[PDB]
Design a protein around this ligand. Sequence first.
Ligand code: HEM
Ligand SMILES: CC(C)c1ccc(NC(=O)O[C@H](Cn2ccnc2)c2ccc(F)cc2)cc1
Length: 434
Amino acid sequence: KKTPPVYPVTVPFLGHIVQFGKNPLEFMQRCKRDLKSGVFTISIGGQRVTIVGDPHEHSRFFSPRNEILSPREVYTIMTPVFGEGVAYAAPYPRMREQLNFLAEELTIAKFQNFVPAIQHEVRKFMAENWKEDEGVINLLEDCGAMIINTACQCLFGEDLRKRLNARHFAQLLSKMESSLIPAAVFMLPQSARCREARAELQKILGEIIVAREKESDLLGGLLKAVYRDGTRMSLHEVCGMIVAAMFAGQHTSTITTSWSMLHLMHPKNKKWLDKLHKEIDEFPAQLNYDNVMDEMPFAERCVRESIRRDPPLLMVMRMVKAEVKVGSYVVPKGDIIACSPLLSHHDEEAFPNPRLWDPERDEKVDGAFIGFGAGVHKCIGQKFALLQVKTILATAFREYDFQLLRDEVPDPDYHTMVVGPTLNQCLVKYTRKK
Ligand code: HEM
Ligand SMILES: CC(C)c1ccc(NC(=O)O[C@H](Cn2ccnc2)c2ccc(F)cc2)cc1
């Protein structure tokens, strides 16, 4: 009457660790079936990990507030990247204000100068890196830069960028992420070797605010932010919120974009691309807000389906402070409760043919899709991400046709914190169009 099933473990100290990491999808789908149940509890190093793997129950995982299902204790890994007292590392009532602060920078108000701004920077990269009319790309790596450029372009003010280029803002993020490795969620030079890259960026920041005062973007907005108790944000506090904002968008969107273009450039799917064209073809090079947002519904379905099939975030997780019920089963305080976009988006009631890419499919259980989370942890980057990505496809499939070298689409590479299409498989051949 008290707790969901448990899965067999041959040797206890290992805790399913190699079984997951080999393939976590295969793994989890096997647990589900065999264990004749969508909810089920796996062990990692004798640490009990109960997955909410029946789509019908998603509400159970995402509705209860942080005090009942706490994210902090799982995501401690990030404290050195974000800050100490920022995001999870901060206290919840406070964190919420940070969420809203950030959310009050991606508001649809500040999106009016984004579409063109990102559209322009796409070409800059194209005309300067895709030079010939016969192409090579490592799409994963190329998207990686388009995204971190267009975002910086979107959120970094002219004075900021000139001091901190997109091309090598990355290098900092990419030094900060080096601190993060697998097997940190359930269990140093890099604490300082990433600390140095934060301390670098931070003092690069503090050095631009002095040039602002003696005299608006995400930074600008963030500094004019005042807490409940009327306090302002510390230098590092603010610095982190740029880091987290920016970290968050970059792999997930790069991957989302890379996946998306891969399916579309694939012949198997070239009725969809033609539909993409029937959608973007009477649009001129002058992309405006109303175009990407109101007149690109099918393009959005492609992007959404790309996330549906290969979600970049495989698990989200909480720490069960109070006890919670989920279907018949119950989850006992002290447990790590998880919920996996990857497994969930493979349930068969919800997504028939879950390895098929059907942009015009529709979840058959309501709430199944959770590639941007749900409940009280709905992603705040969502609209923006969709906006980047949409515009990029719009621009890049207008003015090009694309050709995957392979016979079929790449294989996800489950061997990272944030999953995308296998790097070495992402080679593509572009060819100009007029
Ligand atoms: C396009 C790819 C993206 C995906 C797939 C994605 C996915 C998700 C998911 C699954 C969550 C839930 C996390 C959780 O339950 O703890 C989430 C939350 C969040 N995402 Fe995103 N995200 C994306 C882009 C972005 C971007 C661009 C931003 C920032 C601009 C962002 C900021 C956040 C934040 C702040 C949260 C936390 C919401 C909360 O805990 O209350 N995400 N995202
Ligand atoms: C607004 C400030 C206060 C703030 C607070 C929290 C976040 N959260 C965050 O970035 O979560 C990413 C996951 N994510 C990526 C894309 N969309 C979501 C993440 C990374 C590693 C982990 F371990 C757990 C979570 C962002 C900004």
